[PDB]
Amino acid sequence: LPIDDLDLTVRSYNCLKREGVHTVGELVARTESDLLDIRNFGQKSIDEVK
DNA sequence: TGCATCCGTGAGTCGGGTAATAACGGCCTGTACGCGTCCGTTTCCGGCACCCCAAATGAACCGTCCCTGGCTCCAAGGTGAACTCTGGGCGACGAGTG
DSSP: OBSGGGTOOHHHHHHHHHHTOOBHHHHHHSOHHHHHTSTTOOHHHHHHHO
16 A cells, blocks of 8 residues: 555655655565664654554 | 000299291272352441330438537535644763863
């Protein structure tokens, strides 16, 4: 599924659109350390992804 | 009444073909073939009695497949805010630096 289909918010949508993360398959493949490396990452984004 | 004298029986299996003598006119005809002429056949040009036959020549024709009128009734486009990152700019502080 697309991550946006999970009814996410402004910062997460902008991060997935500018960078190019499209499906939750790559998110479930990527670990928490591999996803928190992004700069200007939001604590709310971390909480919702967790 | 033997006795020789034939006499007639029989005796296995999957390169070819090799020749004389005196014979010779003369006449008849029988069938197949050739010549010339003649005639039924058939084969092809032409005409109306008309048989008309026909695509081509005049309508509608009107329902339908094209235009115009305008009316809407809604979702795309334009209008705010604030806000939550997003980022720029800013100040603080130090231990390797001088």
